Symmetry: C3
């Protein structure tokens, strides 16, 4: 006749590492690292991204003939660009502050193309001959759709003086450019005048562009270049152009309303008609876990990126194949409990109160570590050019330093807390064993294995009497007194 107190055992193969012990198989565990993604590019917080297909932001904006004339998506959360975009700037050249303009255009709440300077405005210049082979539409020479390459008319290029007053209530993005000639003959042939200039003026802008006529390498079959420039014209301000040649004049402009900032994501995954709080170039993370290892360049409210394959928190008990030699595989209905083997039968019992008290606390342990990382803001990727490598290395030092801080702190926290959890489980059993110690002072002997040697007989009902804390010690005290022999 004896009563026993032990812990639970199941068939789990999951192991956890603690600060002092490694590879400790436990009954229950919880990974706080997310490794699952959608494999698709989703909407970010309800807004659809801008997916440019093998075209760059410059190509799309300036109107490369090989790009969708109108995306007519007025709003986007992020811009999706392929790694090495194909079409780009068909006529060789450059766009000023490109990387800044891209940051400006990463998240837009209104985008609408408008016609600010119609070709009718150029009565003494040729608007139809400004085309090239480097800019093709269906094999045919063409040019950027949103600008106008003006050339001489009647061997004469009269000085242009045109102004546009932004009557709209929205800011305007206005793009224009300068054509660099190749020799003096080419200069006079397109623009009668040999010495040329472009002057651009707004309330904040004061620009003097002058063409550079030199020998250059051939790119897309052209040795000349075209440098482009942009400005943001505020409501009720006016832009003032003046030139006598080499002018790539604006024809269309863009109404921008910008309330937020994002980044240009470089990815090739397809739009999945989904929504997500966190987008990575490889797929979307819908998770609440504090840490992830999917991809560094996330956008949105994301878990912290760590260099870890697994971060498993123990939520259970040491599994089995110290007074309590091991756990009971037969106690399938509890975490802490009792065992009896009286004259009538032998059975396994579970301590509901002690069990729930621990299940609540251990889940509170996981939820605390999970939910205290409520610090989730917005994020960005890569945005620096070839002569900005020092700032790029700055961003990399930062990302790596944060990588090291989160990974050390997360891996150590799991190790420190898992040691405490397993200890917390050990202390719970010992207090239960001390509960029956005080209930059966001399009416039972200390066997030492977590079991108690009943001098007197207990029925299955007396066993539930030691359990339930409903046992009378003087009821059987004299029987134990005689059992001493």
């Amino acid at each position: 006749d004896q009563i026993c107190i032990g812990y639970h055992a199941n068939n789990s193969t999951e192991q956890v590492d603690t600060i002092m012990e490694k590879n400790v198989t436990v009954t229950h565990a919880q990974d706080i690292l997310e490794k699952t993604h959608n494999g698709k590019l989703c909407d970010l917080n309800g807004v659809k991204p801008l997916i440019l297909k093998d075209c760059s932001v410059a190509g799309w904006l300036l109107g490369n003939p090989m790009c969708d004339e109108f995306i007519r998506v007025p709003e986007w959360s992020y811009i999706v660009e392929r790694a090495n975009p194909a079409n780009d700037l068909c006529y060789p050249g450059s766009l000023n502050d490109y990387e800044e303009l891209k940051h400006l255009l990463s998240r837009i709440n209104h985008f609408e193309k408008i016609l600010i300077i119609p070709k009718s405005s150029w009565p003494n210049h040729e608007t139809s001959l400004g085309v090239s082979a480097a800019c093709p539409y269906q094999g045919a020479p063409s040019f950027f759709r949103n600008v106008v390459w003006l050339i001489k008319k009647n061997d004469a290029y009269p000085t242009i003086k045109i102004s546009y007053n932004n009557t709209n209530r929205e800011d305007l993005l206005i793009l224009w450019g300068i054509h660099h000639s190749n020799n003096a003959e080419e200069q006079t042939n397109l623009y009668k005048n040999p010495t040329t200039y472009i002057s651009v003026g707004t309330s904040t802008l004061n620009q003097r562009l002058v063409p550079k006529i030199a020998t250059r390498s051939q790119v897309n079959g052209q040795r000349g270049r075209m440098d482009f420039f942009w400005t943001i014209l505020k409501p009720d301000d006016a832009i003032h152009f003046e030139s006598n040649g080499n002018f790539i004049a604006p024809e269309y402009a863009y109404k921008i309303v910008k309330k937020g900032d994002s980044t240009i994501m470089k990815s090739g995954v397809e739009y999945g008609h989904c929504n997500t709080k966190c987008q990575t170039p490889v797929g979307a993370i819908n998770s609440s876990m504090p840490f992830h290892n999917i991809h560094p360049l996330t956008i949105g409210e994301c878990p912290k990126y760590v260099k870890s394959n697994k971060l498993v928190l123990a939520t259970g008990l040491r599994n089995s194949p110290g007074f309590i030699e091991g756990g009971w595989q037969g106690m399938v209905d509890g975490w802490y409990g009792y065992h009896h083997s009286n004259e009538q039968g032998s059975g396994y019992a579970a301590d509901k109160e002690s069990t729930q008290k621990a299940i609540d606390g251990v889940t509170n342990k996981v939820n605390s570590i999970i939910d205290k990382m409520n610090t989730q803001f917005e994020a960005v990727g890569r945005e620096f050019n070839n002569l900005e490598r020092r700032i790029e290395n700055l961003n990399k030092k930062m990302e790596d330093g944060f990588l090291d801080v989160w990974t050390y702190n997360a891996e150590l926290l799991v190790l420190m807390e898992n040691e405490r959890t397993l200890d917390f489980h050990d202390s719970n059993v010992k207090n239960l064993y001390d509960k029956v110690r005080l209930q059966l002072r001399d009416n039972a002997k200390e066997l030492g294995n977590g079991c108690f040697e009943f001098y007197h007989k207990c029925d299955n009902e007396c066993m539930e009497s030691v359990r339930n804390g409903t046992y009378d010690y003087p009821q059987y005290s004299e029987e134990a007194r005689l059992k001493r022999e």
Copy 2:
């Protein structure tokens, strides 16, 4: 006749959370989060700020007529500027490298205006016509006080060639500028010469400026523009100017002595006459706590900013089981005993056990506070509209450290509070063990944290049990015959 053990209880309503348990009332606690500021702007480590009031750095350096002429103070710890300063470049234009100038001027050990090029130095040029409505003073057109807008004299503008050798043993901040005419007629009207230049050269400078005669939009009623430039002439170098028009010449310069940095603060709070090691745009912080939630953009040896409303550390016992709860009747300690005797009944406290615990939890709180390193850091936003990528980097940095310090501080608190509550429980159970070992069969294990005396213990006996000097041989026979 019985003896018991029990922990102290208060009227405290303070609640702490642990890693496994939430909303646990305690008798004592401490918040390691600073939440208060003095509501004023103060001297930082003894040095008064420079409060440009509705003036920008540009309009104070150049002489805007609506800004303060004199530099009252030769040194400052930080600059305070309003959000959208009203008096800035009154004539429309620009100041080169303005953010870097601002950063340079943000903390200065010595600033002193000096006249470098007297207005007498310009005999064949006009020194008095160079005003504008855009820069008004007392109802009349004026201009920046620290430079000169030279104009033609007798319909002629002789090519200027002037040099200034720095003989001041300290660096000099020198400013000049270029005037952008509006049309070829304006140009000859102010400077007879239609094509003009400005050549500035030092030991390190090689600059050539040319006006941009072009149609611009009216700002402050002018379509002209004035671009200003600057430089730091070293203590034995000379600056050489040459121009034949459009020259905004330097008249005054500043002797600079720079030994530290500390960004421009944007606040509208008034200057209280106080000192602080830590200044925010809303107020100053006088604290030794590790963490705070006052403002992101501090200056000085400040606590770490976190996104937390409170960081409370439990330093006491759980407030009102095996001990059946706490004793609100206990007044003179944290761990105590209960005499229940026919001679007398009362409460007593373990003097050493309590003091060992209050010293430890005090060491726990003091350790968390004292291990924080405070480095002088000036957090400010110093990037213009075409510098938004670098601003994003700074944001990511600020935001990352915020997320680290908040996560650590929140989890440190939860974790150490679970340990603090179990540390009180272990110290209590050790007192139960001391009494249990001294009286095995002489006392009875009631199980509710109390002992049942078979023997009748004097109030002198009761102290001996606490003193750890009970003699089981004294009346072990009493218990033998009592067990019936």
Copy 3:
């Protein structure tokens, strides 16, 4: 008559602090902070540094006569410049994007100087008169060796139009330059061409340079200046120069193959002919420790820099559940017993319990060391005077991380030290409870961790209780009357 459960004591003078207790003398400890360096500049992962000595990256690159040697290292891992290199640009001027060039050049896999434009290519110009006293060689006017200063021939300077196609499969770093003369006479007496230009064109480059004839200050005896420029010619592109005069033309160029990044180190210590994974400006760190306090500016796979001077982890026990403890006699374990009978008295140790403690504390120490993730990094200052806002961002980032690692590492030591000392206390209590449970009735507990055998037990039964093989029915209640 007595057996006792006690712990080890030694003669260690090492103290560690804990979250609740300070200056706790322990038996064994481990400092996880590295403080020692060999005092030499070493190779990084088997690659030699490039130790420019009193020469700048521009002097070495452009071929300063005073620079001691031509190109000698074909691959490097980092560059070593002296704080203020003495040589640099012997003729006064500048080099465009010098700090971005120094970044690219910081870690180069392949580097080879090649002759791209021989002097035979300048028939109608003079390639021999392009010298200056500023570049002095051996007491004689000289000049940069990798670039040629072209001068008129027969009072004529015919326009240069020249193209170099990159026929190599490696990229080519090409440097050219422009000379700013001082007055219109010097311009004619050197280039016989009053208005001059320099156009440089590649597949990506489209430059126009025009001299600035202007009064400047004397540097190294020259009021003139030379501004140099560089570009990277890709493997099948060609560069095209055109120039009326003032051309400092490329003679030599460098084959570049770049496959990783580093930074430039400012140090004066010398090569030790050693190899390391981690390099500071004062020496090299060969350590697995997670934290170090040597220098902030490290290149390589380094530990985290912290401000602390001691991070001592505790691996043993307190030094003078036995109340006194402090058994200086025990030498072969941490936990053990002590016997007392007619044969004699001596100390014994528990092998199974002690070993699991040593396994545990060392696995903790290893876990703290081993869980640190080290990335290759290069901490250096790469910003100029008009970049001090970026420098501050760097400083804030560095200083922000220093504060993060210092606090967390300090609390880690403190928290885990106190938990380890207390877990050892649980282990000696596990031994006492095992002994007390077996001696159910035949023995009394004295209170000091010891047990009084009423029925005196000799050497033979001491091993049975120790081994857990104690036979309770074998000898029992022999002398109940010993208690009387």
